[PDB]
């Protein structure tokens, strides 16, 4: 009932860190994103992933990074992880030059397309907006199998990031992983990340329309076993 972790490598971890965008996109500089990346770099490295951080990629670069990565030989690896830090809209992330469908970035790893990652977990963590809604708060193996998307927010909603500390989702995810990454199952970790973000964060803003908002992450799992980074 657990994913076999007996491989010489845990797996590759691609971190796409998009901070500066083309003015044609009209997207602002994501302050605090470098802090997220560095933190995420330390966590996933600790977990034992071979992480490489790619900055200000463009949609093609991103698609290539993923197409190529899916093309490597993952036979000696337990899994694959990819973390996306950037701007976004519903179903789409922003390259420095525009927006590309997350579905395209992930499909490369389908069972029919990455045989060496077949029956192995493929993890994508996405920190990006998914719309413009604010939460006010209240006081034969299937080809689509073995994927897990840890989104920072829910469909149709904004995702918060503090210029000086990083995004809520990443601050949360990193504290949890640092302390429990090696002892709790992935769903437990993400559930705790879910609770941490919901209870410990609340937007501070000068625009009242954007003041005191809350946020809840969203985990989608097509996993078929329990995942322990150990």
């Amino acid at each position: 009932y657990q994913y076999n972790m007996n491989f010489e490598k845990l797996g590759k971890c691609i971190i796409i860190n998009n901070k500066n965008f083309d003015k044609v996109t009209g997207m602002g500089v994501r302050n605090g994103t470098d802090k997220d990346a560095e933190a995420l770099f330390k966590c996933f490295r600790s977990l034992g992933f071979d992480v490489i951080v790619y900055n200000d990629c463009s949609c093609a670069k991103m698609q290539d990074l993923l197409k190529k990565a899916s093309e490597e030989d993952h036979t000696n690896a337990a899994c694959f992880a990819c973390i996306l830090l950037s701007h976004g809209e519903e179903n789409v992330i922003y390259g420095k030059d525009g927006v590309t469908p997350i579905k395209d970035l992930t499909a490369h790893f389908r069972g029919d397309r990455s045989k060496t990652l077949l029956e192995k977990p493929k993890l994508f963590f996405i920190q990006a907006c998914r719309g413009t809604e604010l939460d006010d708060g209240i006081q034969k193996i299937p080809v689509e199998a073995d994927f897990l998307f840890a989104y920072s927010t829910v469909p149709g909603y904004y995702s918060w990031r503090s210029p000086g500390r990083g995004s809520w989702f990443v601050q949360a995810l990193c504290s949890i992983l640092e302390e429990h990454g090696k002892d709790l199952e992935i769903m437990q970790i993400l559930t705790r990340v879910n609770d941490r973000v919901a209870r410990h964060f609340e937007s501070q803003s000068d625009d009242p329309h954007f003041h005191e908002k809350k946020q809840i992450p969203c985990v989608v799992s097509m996993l078929t076993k329990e995942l322990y980074f150990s």
């Binding site: 602002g28 994501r30 302050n31 605090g32 950037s86 701007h87 976004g88 920190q127 990006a128 907006c129 920072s152 904004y158 995702s159 918060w160 990031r161 503090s162 210029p163 995004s167 937007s203 501070q204 803003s205 954007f210």
Partner: peptide
């Protein structure tokens, strides 16, 4: 706070 900023949003993404």
């Amino acid at each position: 706070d900023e949003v993404x």
